[PDB]
Amino acid sequence: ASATWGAAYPACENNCRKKYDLCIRCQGKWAGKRGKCAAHCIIQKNNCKGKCKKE
């Protein structure tokens, strides 16, 4: 009706969805930082949703 967007930029955000899932290196990279390997990486896919989407 009005706020009909998302299929124009999708990548812009999808990139962080993959990223979030390509960032959880709870092993090695996050050798013990597990608790945050997760949270940390999820806030990415989510921050993205505020840079590409309006909802």
Rg over alpha carbons for the chain, rounded to the nearest Å, is 14
Residues with Cβ < 8 Å from 48, sequence gap 6 or more?
12, 13, 15, 16, 17, 19
Angstrom CA distances, 45 to 1, 2, 3, 21, 22, stand at 26, 25, 21, 9, 11
Q: How many domains does the chain have?
A: 1
3 is in which domain, residue-wise?
Answer: 1-55
The CATH number assigned to the domain holding 8 equals 1.10.287.120
Residues in the chain whose C lies over 2.5 Å from the next residue's N (breaks after):
none
